[PDB]
Amino acid sequence: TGALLSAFVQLCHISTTLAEKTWVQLFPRLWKILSDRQQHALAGEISPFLCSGSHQVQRDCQPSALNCFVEAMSQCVPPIPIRPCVLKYLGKTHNLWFRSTLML
């Protein structure tokens, strides 16, 4: 299996598209295996990371990293805790308009 993952990663490197999708489709898979103790803390600390202050240079990035990260986070089963203010901020600043509206 080690020969598959290395080449998969080297392939995701060159292509920004169809690699955003890999994160969107793999992060919830990781969330599924995380126990309640880990999931609680991770969801409680993700919002500070969704803000993460000066992590705004992606504001002009077409596939902004925050877009993919919040998409993956919302595509999980139990992700209840997320602030609506941060949701609106991400929707306005980043290209998360309709996703943010659907979540809200």
């Binding site: 998969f8 990663v9 995701c12 295996i33 990260f69």
Partner: protein
């Protein structure tokens, strides 16, 4: 770190040389120097996101061993302890994919 990559982006030779220099600084003589690594975070990140595969590999091999081989630890790291501001309009989530798939 500040000027060599700004004024000579096309001449990949001196860029690779500087990246090998910083990789050696990070790899060898660690017991002696550990404060210099604080300011050279942008250099390390740039060398990690460079377009050359060998440089990326030798940077990731040292970026991975610095953390425990546990999915939860790496997730917490990338979510609260790692600052992606120095990356610069980069799709850094592919480095998260690297870190999450290498521990498998």
């Amino acid at each position: 770190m500040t000027y060599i990559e700004k004024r000579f982006p096309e001449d990949l030779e001196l860029n690779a040389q500087f990246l090998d220099l910083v990789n050696y600084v990070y790899r060898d003589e660690t017991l002696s120097g550990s404060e210099l690594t604080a300011k050279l975070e942008p250099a390390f990140l740039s060398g990690l996101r460079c377009a050359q595969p060998l440089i990326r590999a030798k940077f990731f091999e040292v970026f991975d061993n610095s953390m425990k081989r546990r999915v939860y630890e790496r997730l917490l790291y990338v979510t609260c302890s790692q600052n992606w501001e120095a990356m610069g309009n980069h799709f850094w989530i592919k480095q998260c994919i690297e870190l999450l798939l290498a521990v498998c």
